[PDB]
Amino acid sequence: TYKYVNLREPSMDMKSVTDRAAQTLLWTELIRGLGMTLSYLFREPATINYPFEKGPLSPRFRGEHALRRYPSGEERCIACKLCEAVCPAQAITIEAEPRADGSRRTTRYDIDMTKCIYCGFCQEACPVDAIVEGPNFEFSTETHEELLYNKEKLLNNGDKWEAEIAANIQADYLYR
Amino acid sequence: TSVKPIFSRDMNEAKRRVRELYRAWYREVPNTVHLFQLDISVKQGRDKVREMFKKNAHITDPRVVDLLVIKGKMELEETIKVWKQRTHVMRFFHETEAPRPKDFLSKFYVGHDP
Amino acid sequence: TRPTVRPRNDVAHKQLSAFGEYVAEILPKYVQQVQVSCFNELEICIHPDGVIPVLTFLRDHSNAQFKSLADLTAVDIPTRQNRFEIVYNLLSLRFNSRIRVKTYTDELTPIESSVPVYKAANWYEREIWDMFGVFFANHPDLRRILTDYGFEGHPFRKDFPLSGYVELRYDDEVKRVVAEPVELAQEFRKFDLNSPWEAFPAYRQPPE
Amino acid sequence: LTLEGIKDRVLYVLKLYDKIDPEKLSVNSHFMKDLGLDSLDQVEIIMAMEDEFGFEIPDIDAEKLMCPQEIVDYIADKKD
Amino acid sequence: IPHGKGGRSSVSGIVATVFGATGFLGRYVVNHLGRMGSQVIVPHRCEPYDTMHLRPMGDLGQIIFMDWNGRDKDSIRRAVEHSSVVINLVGREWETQNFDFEDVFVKIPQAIAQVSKEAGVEKFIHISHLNADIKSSSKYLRSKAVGEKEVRETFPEATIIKPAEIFGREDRFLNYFANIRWFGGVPLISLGKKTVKQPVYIVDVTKGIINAIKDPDARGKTFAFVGPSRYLLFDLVQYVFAVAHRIGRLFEISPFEPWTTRDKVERIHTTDKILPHLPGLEDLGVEATPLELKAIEVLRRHRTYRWLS
Amino acid sequence: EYVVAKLDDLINWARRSSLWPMTFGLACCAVEMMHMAAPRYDMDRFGVVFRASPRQSDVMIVAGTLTNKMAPALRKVYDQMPEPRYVVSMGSCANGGGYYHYSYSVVRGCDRIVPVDIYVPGCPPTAEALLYGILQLQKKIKREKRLRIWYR
Ligand SMILES: NC(=O)c1ccc[n+]([C@@H]2O[C@H](COP(=O)([O-])OP(=O)(O)OC[C@H]3O[C@@H](n4cnc5c(N)ncnc54)[C@H](OP(=O)(O)O)[C@@H]3O)[C@@H](O)[C@H]2O)c1
Numbered sequence A: 001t002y003k004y005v006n007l008r009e010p011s012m013d014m015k016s017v018t019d020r021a022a023q024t025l026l027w028t029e030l031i032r033g034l035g036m037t038l039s040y041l042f043r044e045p046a047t048i049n050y051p052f053e054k055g056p057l058s059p060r061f062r063g064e065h066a067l068r069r070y071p072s073g074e075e076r077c078i079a080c081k082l083c084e085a086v087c088p089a090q091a092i093t094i095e096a097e098p099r100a101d102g103s104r105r106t107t108r109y110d111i112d113m114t115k116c117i118y119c120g121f122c123q124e125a126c127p128v129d130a131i132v133e134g135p136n137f138e139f140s141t142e143t144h145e146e147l148l149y150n151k152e153k154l155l156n157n158g159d160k161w162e163a164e165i166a167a168n169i170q171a172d173y174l175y176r
Numbered sequence B: 001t002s003v004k005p006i007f008s009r010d011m012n013e014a015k016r017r018v019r020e021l022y023r024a025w026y027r028e029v030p031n032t033v034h035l036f037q038l039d040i041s042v043k044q045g046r047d048k049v050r051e052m053f054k055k056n057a058h059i060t061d062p063r064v065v066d067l068l069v070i071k072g073k074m075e076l077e078e079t080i081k082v083w084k085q086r087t088h089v090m091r092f093f094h095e096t097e098a099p100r101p102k103d104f105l106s107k108f109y110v111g112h113d114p
Numbered sequence C: 001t002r003p004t005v006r007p008r009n010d011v012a013h014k015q016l017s018a019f020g021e022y023v024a025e026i027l028p029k030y031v032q033q034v035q036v037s038c039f040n041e042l043e044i045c046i047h048p049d050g051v052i053p054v055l056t057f058l059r060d061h062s063n064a065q066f067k068s069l070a071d072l073t074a075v076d077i078p079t080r081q082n083r084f085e086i087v088y089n090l091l092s093l094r095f096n097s098r099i100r101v102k103t104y105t106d107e108l109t110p111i112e113s114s115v116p117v118y119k120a121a122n123w124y125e126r127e128i129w130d131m132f133g134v135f136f137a138n139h140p141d142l143r144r145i146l147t148d149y150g151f152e153g154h155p156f157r158k159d160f161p162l163s164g165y166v167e168l169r170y171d172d173e174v175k176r177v178v179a180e181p182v183e184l185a186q187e188f189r190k191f192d193l194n195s196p197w198e199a200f201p202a203y204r205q206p207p208e
Numbered sequence D: 001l002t003l004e005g006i007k008d009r010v011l012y013v014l015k016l017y018d019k020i021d022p023e024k025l026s027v028n029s030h031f032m033k034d035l036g037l038d039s040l041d042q043v044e045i046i047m048a049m050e051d052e053f054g055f056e057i058p059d060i061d062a063e064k065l066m067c068p069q070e071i072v073d074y075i076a077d078k079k080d
Numbered sequence E: 001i002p003h004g005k006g007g008r009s010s011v012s013g014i015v016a017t018v019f020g021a022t023g024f025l026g027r028y029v030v031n032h033l034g035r036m037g038s039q040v041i042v043p044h045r046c047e048p049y050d051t052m053h054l055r056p057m058g059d060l061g062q063i064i065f066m067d068w069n070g071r072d073k074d075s076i077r078r079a080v081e082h083s084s085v086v087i088n089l090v091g092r093e094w095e096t097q098n099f100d101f102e103d104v105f106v107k108i109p110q111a112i113a114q115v116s117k118e119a120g121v122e123k124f125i126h127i128s129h130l131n132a133d134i135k136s137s138s139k140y141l142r143s144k145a146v147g148e149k150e151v152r153e154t155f156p157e158a159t160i161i162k163p164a165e166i167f168g169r170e171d172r173f174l175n176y177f178a179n180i181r182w183f184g185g186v187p188l189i190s191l192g193k194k195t196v197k198q199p200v201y202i203v204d205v206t207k208g209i210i211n212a213i214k215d216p217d218a219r220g221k222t223f224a225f226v227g228p229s230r231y232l233l234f235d236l237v238q239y240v241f242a243v244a245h246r247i248g249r250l251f252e253i254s255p256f257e258p259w260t261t262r263d264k265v266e267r268i269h270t271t272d273k274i275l276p277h278l279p280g281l282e283d284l285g286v287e288a289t290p291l292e293l294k295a296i297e298v299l300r301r302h303r304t305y306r307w308l309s
Numbered sequence F: 001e002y003v004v005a006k007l008d009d010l011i012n013w014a015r016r017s018s019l020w021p022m023t024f025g026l027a028c029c030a031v032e033m034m035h036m037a038a039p040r041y042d043m044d045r046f047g048v049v050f051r052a053s054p055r056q057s058d059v060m061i062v063a064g065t066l067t068n069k070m071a072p073a074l075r076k077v078y079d080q081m082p083e084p085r086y087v088v089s090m091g092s093c094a095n096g097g098g099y100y101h102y103s104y105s106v107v108r109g110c111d112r113i114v115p116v117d118i119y120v121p122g123c124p125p126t127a128e129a130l131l132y133g134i135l136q137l138q139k140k141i142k143r144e145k146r147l148r149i150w151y152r
């Protein structure tokens, strides 16, 4: 359909034009709002007082990585070379080679933490359900020699909290 | 080959052209060399210009010799003005880059199979 | 078939057969092919001669308005023996339709600017000179947009290896920020996805 | 406005460049069936006789000179 | 073992170490090892933040920092244990209110000529100066020619180096002049006689090392560094006013870091050009650089535009 | 003797408690910088007043992606800043370039161009791991200007 805005004409009669000459010359407008709508300061401030208080999130949040393990640990990753092949940024790097018993596992697993674009494509391709984006924004170290991760940085970083992780998926896994 | 040429017709008006804008370069190297506050021997600036124009020498054809120009005709826009900041210019004269051997036996001790 | 498959509509496909039937009728000096995309859009294959001419007919008329120029672009195909391609794309405000105009070319053969017909091909023609290398003559201005001042390669065509030929890095040995050949920290792995068996019978290339 | 004006100015210039001509200051020098250089180089010589003495050579002139004769002469009939 | 090409993010098989390497010279060497590939372990004394302006020098995981004192015989033994070549630029100007300066050219260059010799470094290197002569001069210039004697005993293979008065970008040599806005230029000592020395440009010296850094076949065999042509005049002090057209300091200021009414005034006029028979440069070359052309750059003052020199 | 090391409980508490950050808007990451100065998580009035001119600053901040043509601009601006300067990159594109890391016209990494100090990792860092990236930089002044004058 339509509408027309800013289409109006002044009335042009001496009952009006005072009302527009009691405005220009006496400032009866322009004190209407910012004489007032500004104050209106008397509302409670809204601030999350940071070092202590913190704000909301959701169980589907994304962040620092992990590699779980079952009960008594198997290093849940089977090195099926997938979370590697859907990765848009191509951070992941994986090198398998048959472990002594003959069950296969990894050797090098490196997520670069600069390239990773935080998809949620590597949480959703792993069929054996290993690699999982943690909900901890712990980060920010002082040397780029660092953020590159090896395998045996990840596991700890994913065994430091599994009380966080293992209780999110069981909220979220019923939807997908 | 039947397609309309760009500016030139055969090789003469063409090779009148390359002679021409040479001078716009040759007459203006140095006004920049004081303008960017870059320091070099002003004769270098007249060696490179003449080092480049002698480079592509084997060109057999119109519409090539007109193509190169349309590039060359441009640059005098940027350089005679300031759209570059010192570091789009000096990149012509490569200061930092370690030399290439280009000889034989100097290769054979450094680098595989070029 | 209905539930998950996009329901078609015929009416739109009858008219854009007609209205495009006869623009091969009244400008046969130029138009060399026309067809109807199964989604109800048109593609007019036009010789490179008419570009300013044909649009100008499409520019005004009472049976075809096509005042709004939306999208100029290009595609570059090797093994087409005339490399590049243009595709103009025009919306006719009264009649609610899209009709695209395809015109081939090469690098060396110039094409003539559309700028007096529409003033919105002013930029879209400056760009293409940077990327693919097509050279538009008689253009009020021709310059360098989207690219730095150093790229002598005209990237988006199919010969530019993705990472360009010179990485950049700053060194304090003097002042400047200078340019040293490209040295990566990872190969850019090349995966290989193209699976056999030819799942599409309808598009089956000629038997040969 | 003297033929000692335009023969004095010309003949020293051609010596002054650091390149080929070694005192061929004889006024005939015919350039590359004569002494020889690259065509682009001959196109360098033209300019410094203009910033000096004042002049242009806008045109196909510089292609025909080929000798400090003609240049002197084409200057001769030009100024006076 | 060297791989690939020398651009950056390459190997080229040499480790290194560079002691000092904060002030004028050392910063300007490592910058030539943050290019051709290396492992440059640069330690440093007291300075946490003054070393940052360096870090975009090696690519990534190349240069690596430690902390050390240097009168502790361990601090030099913890790093070098893995190394190939190790050069040494250490030492400075004026006697410190803490370091008594006597053996800091004697004990320090030996303190790092401790287990380095033992632990299996090789191609160890040290610095000398063109003008240091064990005859009596000069209170600072002396104790430097002791290292040529005293220290050379250890590590029979050195290729210890002997360059001239150098002029860099941020250097303090030719910059003591033109800072001399003052009651007037007074040459040393109000005489135009023996100026000047061999003013080689800082690139060539810092391109000498890395040319000897795997030379090969220069070890034990010391070299000295030619200047340009030729000796020079008094005009050098006029040349300053010809074109010029007339780390870890403090928060507010430094109490004393002076012009030193001491060796400083007499160290600059000591001249003594010395033995030619040292190989010493083109052999290690190929480099020599002039003055007249390279002295505009480092000199820019309140006109900042006009030159016409 | 001991007065110096007690003096640096003043000057090393002054420079950390008032910062005048420049910012660079370039790319997506700029908006999750704004919301640091919007009232929810309130950047200013926690000691750090927001943008000023290039000359008056201390901590510049790099957001966004750094192409070729922007490098000649940055390195110049980083200079003019006064002494007590730092560089805190943020976002997954100042760390090695997000993606685009393989492109032709993106500088790879923005450590290459300047001596960067603190990092933060992800398309937009969540407007949180920003401030916890600064409460790193207000804790990254434990340094002392003592023990340069006063040891060597
Ligand atoms: N070959 C020549 O032409 C020439 C000319 C002049 C002087 N020199 C002498 O040859 C070497 C060149 O030095 P330079 O050009 O780089 O100037 P420099 O300013 O003396 O550089 C020396 C660096 O090492 C530091 N340093 C001073 N004493 C130290 C010590 N005992 N232990 C560890 N570090 C110490 C200095 O301060 P920090 O301790 O804070 O790091 C400085 O960072 C020096 O020994 C110099 O005295 C040579």
Ligand code: SF4
Binding pocket: A076, A077, A078, A079, A080, A081, A082, A083, A084, A125, A126, A127, A128, A129, A130, A131
């Ligand atoms: S997690 Fe899934 S994807 Fe990542 S490695 Fe183990 S199996 Fe392959």
Ligand code: SF4
Binding pocket: A086, A087, A088, A089, A090, A091, A092, A115, A116, A117, A118, A119, A120, A121, A122, A123
């Ligand atoms: S996190 Fe996002 S980017 Fe990093 S790997 Fe998994 S998907 Fe690829």
Ligand code: SF4
Binding pocket: F027, F028, F029, F063, F064, F065, F091, F092, F093, F094, F098, F099, F122, F123, F124
């Ligand atoms: S990564 Fe940070 S910077 Fe690169 S695009 Fe996503 S947000 Fe903008």
